[PDB]
């Protein structure tokens, strides 16, 4: 009945988001403090030029010409050697921010397939609240994930029954429940109110009128009387 | 150009290499009790 | 050694130094915590992670902002300045339930997360 | 009892005191060694802030605080070990403090205190609790709900092949069954050493981490 | 070691979320069997489910 209005209601989600996108430029810092740490690591990397170790000297024609190659190549050496420090500890830490980064990507081929080529069962996985769907946007040395996901807002306090019994078999619904809207009782769903009429149809014969207290009587509809 | 000691917002920027420092918690630097005094100690009159 | 007596040794009150400054554009009070230690060498408030100068504290309760530490966190509000709270601890939800009872869900939203 | 470390003992090394005991010249020499000191802080305090945010992620899947009602009606569930008991002064629970009893900042490496106080750790505890146990499997997609424990049960039942007739005949039996079982792991942890080991031991392996680091 | 505790952490937030937040049709993630419900409890750096 409402294909139009539930469109509308993706439609508007998509336009809040686009509108928070363009005015929330910290939004990709998820993206971006990674490719920071690929910054500021090709920073130091960089930096670490700079740095000498105890060097006399950062120019590399400026350690040959003046020392004798008995000492300057092995001055050379043990510089060349704190680089090599440098590049264990860049791919180290490198490789562990890889190993994050494969996890994402192992977490990202199981939201491409469990999100994308279907719907992921596990909660909080792929959104906050339950999970539609996921669309992907590729992004700089990364991926953007737009969760579509069911989230309830507004909540009212209702009415249940704990069971009826008519004549001797106790009822319980196993699809519906029995529901009281202020005036009415019929039976509805777990999860959304839909009005119905009670009959075989919304209830199911189930334990026992021997132990409940509070024991109530109603009607059960024969099609055949 | 901004000093690295006037005042904790300049040594935050000095430190950040940034000259516009958004929302956050940062450091700076460290906080330590200076060597008021010197304790030597001898026994009692060993 | 000279008398007989026994002392603790507590390493003498140390640690870092945090800066709480919001938004250059937005405003330029800064805010000085000083992790592990106690207020010593420093309108000003103690916190378990420091003392902290330049906040207030304030008994209500607002959106949690830039946490601090110890369940403290600090808001730009009010002129105005920085204030350090105990986190928002929210309203009460849960009572008594039974088989009469249900929490329905009217409305919703889709949300692109 | 599934043993699981979340957070880690977050620490933080002024490698300014850390390595040079009040030589400003040790320190200027460090930082000839250019950012390794400052990457390993940054890169501490970003696993700070990761148990930071898991305890965000992990304990505060609530953004706003719940609590417990002083009326424990659950229908025979017995949780006297694991809601908090208000009667003593923290707001921890029974099992919680046998769990705190079993296990076990001076030379330059410095401790930060969780964001999150161990009594606001306790409270996020109790407030997911809650969420189970009165809103129901609603509590983290957004705003609670109510759901009957007993009516969870059922469907429980329901989904593995059992009907809920045993609701109706033996609430009070299958409460019996939850509650003994908490008490064969309450003598589980008052007696075996090793029940918590999985804590234990990434206690322990972060103790001689640091004992570690202190004996380096 | 915290790589281990970050896989743990993002364990312990999908059992936040599927032992916690609802049933995991997870087998053998929530404890051995077919699971029902688990129940949190705080303790000093970890979890106990």
């Given at each position: 009945?409402?294909?139009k ?6 439609n508007?989600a998509?336009?809040?988001?686009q509108?928070?996108?363009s ?5 990709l ?8 740490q690929?910054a ?25 010409s ?9 001055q050379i050496?043990?510089?060349i ?5 440098s ?12 190993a994050?980064?494969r ?12 999100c ?6 596990r ?19 990364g991926?953007?994930?737009?969760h579509?996901?069911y ?32 005036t009415?009782w ?20 189930s ?8 024991i109530?009587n109603?009607?059960?509809y024969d099609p055949l009387? | ?9 300049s040594?935050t ?12 918690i ?16 001898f026994?009692n009159?060993? | 050694?000279?008398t007989?007596e ?30 592990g ?15 902290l100068?330049?906040?207030?504290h304030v ?5 949690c902002d830039?946490?601090i530490?110890?369940?403290?966190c ?13 986190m928002?601890l929210?309203?009460?939800?849960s ?8 929490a329905?869900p009217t ?7 | ?12 090394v ?5 390595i040079?005991?009040?030589?400003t ?12 000191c ?9 696993i ?7 305890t965000q992620?992990?304990?505060?899947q609530?953004?706003?605080?719940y ?5 424990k ?5 017995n949780?006297?070990?694991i ?14 403090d ?6 076990t900042?001076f ?14 750790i ?17 509590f ?20 593995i ?7 109706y005949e ?37 103790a ?9």
């Amino acid at each position: 009945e409402n294909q139009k209005l539930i469109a509308n209601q993706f439609n508007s989600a998509i336009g809040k988001i686009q509108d928070s996108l363009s005015s929330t430029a910290s939004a990709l810092g998820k993206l971006q403090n990674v490719v920071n740490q690929n910054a500021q690591a090709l920073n130091t990397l960089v930096k670490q030029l700079s740095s000498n170790f105890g060097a006399i000297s950062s120019v590399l024609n400026d350690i040959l010409s003046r020392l004798d190659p008995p000492e300057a190549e092995v001055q050379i050496d043990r510089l060349i050697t704190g680089r090599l420090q440098s590049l264990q500890t860049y791919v180290t830490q490198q490789l562990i921010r890889a190993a994050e980064i494969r996890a994402s990507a192992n977490l990202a081929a199981t939201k491409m397939s469990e999100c994308v080529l279907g719907q992921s069962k596990r909660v909080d996985f792929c959104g906050k609240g339950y999970h539609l769907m996921s669309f992907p946007q590729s992004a700089p040395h990364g991926v953007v994930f737009l969760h579509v996901t069911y989230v309830p807002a507004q909540e009212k306090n209702f009415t249940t029954a704990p069971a009826i019994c008519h004549d001797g078999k106790a009822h319980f619904p196993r699809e519906g429940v029995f529901v009281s809207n202020g005036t009415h009782w019929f039976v509805t769903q777990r999860n959304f109110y839909e009005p119905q009429i009670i009959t075989t149809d919304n209830t199911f014969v189930s334990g026992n009128c021997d132990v409940v207290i509070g024991i109530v009587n109603n009607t059960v509809y024969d099609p055949l009387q | 150009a901004v000093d690295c000691a006037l005042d904790p917002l300049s040594e935050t920027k000095c430190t950040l290499k940034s000259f516009t420092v958004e929302k956050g918690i940062y450091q700076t630097s460290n906080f330590r009790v200076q060597p008021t005094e010197s304790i030597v100690r001898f026994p009692n009159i060993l | 050694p000279q008398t007989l007596e026994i002392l603790d040794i507590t390493p003498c009150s140390f640690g870092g130094v945090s800066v709480i400054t919001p938004g250059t554009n937005t405003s330029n009070q800064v805010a000085v915590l000083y992790q592990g230690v106690n207020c010593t060498e420093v309108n000003v408030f103690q916190t378990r992670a420091g003392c902290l100068i330049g906040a207030e504290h304030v008994n209500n309760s607002y959106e949690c902002d830039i946490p601090i530490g110890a369940g403290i966190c600090a808001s730009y509000q009010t002129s105005q300045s920085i204030i350090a709270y105990t986190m928002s601890l929210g309203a009460e939800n849960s009572v008594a339930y039974s088989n009469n009872s249900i929490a329905i869900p009217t409305n919703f939203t889709i949300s692109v997360t | 009892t599934e043993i699981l470390p979340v957070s880690m003992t977050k620490t933080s090394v002024d490698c300014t005191m850390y390595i040079c005991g009040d030589s400003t010249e040790c320190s200027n020499l460090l930082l000839q060694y250019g950012s390794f000191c400052t990457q390993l802080n940054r890169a501490l305090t970003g696993i700070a802030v990761e148990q930071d945010k898991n305890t965000q992620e992990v304990f505060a899947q609530v953004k706003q605080i719940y609590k417990t009602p002083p009326i424990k009606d659950f229908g025979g569930f017995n949780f006297s070990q694991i809601l908090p008991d208000p009667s003593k002064p923290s707001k921890r629970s029974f099992i919680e403090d046998l769990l705190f009893n079993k296990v076990t900042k001076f030379n330059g490496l410095t401790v930060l205190p969780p964001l999150l106080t161990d009594e606001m750790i306790a409270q996020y505890t109790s407030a997911l609790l809650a969420g189970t146990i009165t809103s129901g499997w609603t509590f983290g997609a957004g705003a609670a709900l109510q759901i009957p424990f007993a009516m969870q049960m059922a469907y429980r039942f329901n989904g593995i092949g059992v009907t809920q007739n045993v609701l109706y005949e033996n609430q009070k039996l299958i409460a019996n069954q939850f509650n003994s079982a908490i008490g064969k792991i309450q003598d589980s942890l008052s007696s075996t050493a090793s029940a918590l080991g999985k804590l234990q031991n990434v206690v322990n392996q972060n103790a001689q981490a640091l004992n570690t680091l202190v004996k380096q």
